[PDB]
Amino acid sequence: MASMKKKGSVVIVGRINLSGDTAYAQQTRGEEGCQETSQTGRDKNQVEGEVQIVSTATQTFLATSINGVLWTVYHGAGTRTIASPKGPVTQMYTNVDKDLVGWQAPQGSRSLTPCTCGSSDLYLVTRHADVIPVRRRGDSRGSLLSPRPISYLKGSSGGPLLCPAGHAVGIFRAAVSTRGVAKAVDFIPVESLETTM
Ligand SMILES: COc1ccc2nc(C)c(O[C@@H]3C[C@H]4C(=O)N[C@]5(C(=O)NS(=O)(=O)C6(C)CC6)C[C@H]5/C=C\CCCCC[C@H](NC(=O)OC5(C)CCC5)C(=O)N4C3)nc2c1
Ligand SMILES: [Zn+2]
Numbered sequence: 001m002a003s004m005k006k007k008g009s010v011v012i013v014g015r016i017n018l019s020g021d022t023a024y025a026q027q028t029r030g031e032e033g034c035q036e037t038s039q040t041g042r043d044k045n046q047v048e049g050e051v052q053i054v055s056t057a058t059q060t061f062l063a064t065s066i067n068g069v070l071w072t073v074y075h076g077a078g079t080r081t082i083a084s085p086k087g088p089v090t091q092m093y094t095n096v097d098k099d100l101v102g103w104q105a106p107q108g109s110r111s112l113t114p115c116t117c118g119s120s121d122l123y124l125v126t127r128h129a130d131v132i133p134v135r136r137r138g139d140s141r142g143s144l145l146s147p148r149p150i151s152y153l154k155g156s157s158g159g160p161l162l163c164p165a166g167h168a169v170g171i172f173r174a175a176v177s178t179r180g181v182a183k184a185v186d187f188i189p190v191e192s193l194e195t196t197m
Pocket of ligand 1: 059060061062074075076096097098099150151153154155156157172173174175176186
């Protein structure tokens with residue numbers, strides 16, 4: 001019992017900048033600082049933007065602020081705390097049945113607005129700042145207009161699907177593939193988040 005370890009915190013290591021004319025990834029912390037922040041849970045870096053790049057000791061993925069909650073996937077974060085300036089912060093939402101977790105949105109982040117447009121013309125934002133057109137096909141499904149190898153989507157779970165107006169429509173959860181080519185995506189609809197709150 002004395003030699004039992006504690007898993008580290010999720011750590012913000014960068015962001016996807018959607019501010020201006022061009023989307024681009026920014027890194028805010030390197031691997032050594034990430035590993036240390038994961039163990040202490042103390043992250044004093046300023047946070048900005050809507051889409052964060054996050055990492056554990058073993059995985060990296062995305063997390064998206066909607067309505068004052070930083071949302072991501074359970075298969076990335078598990079039940080882990082997130083590092084913050086005052087120490088590890090416990091999850092405010094955990095739903096393994098939805099592959100969904102959330103923490104209070106960090107001070108300085110901006111939140112996306114939940115979409116009420118009812119539009120089926122969506123855009124998936126990846127960890128490489130690709131903005132991928134996706135046609136909505138169901139409550140939790142959308143097809144890529146231009147399929148591509150799943151490699152290009154790996155590490156983007158927790159990223160947003162946006163409507164034409166830039167509202168949040170869902171959180172990227174899984175990729176549907178044939179012969180390694182992603183033809184469709186599975187996502188947590190924003191309404192499932194809004195119900196969870
Ligand atoms: C443990 O407790 C839980 C609870 C509920 C869970 N619920 C789901 C649906 C789940 O699925 C896992 C993880 C997810 C994934 O891989 N997600 C993306 C991703 O990027 N992760 S990641 O960031 O790299 C990483 C791992 C965090 C660091 C976007 C994926 C990108 C590429 C796919 C790669 C090949 C995989 C193709 C696969 N496909 C698929 O399952 O399709 C369907 C059958 C499911 C409905 C249709 C797929 O996508 N996943 C498999 N695990 C759960 C686990
Ligand atoms: Zn909208």
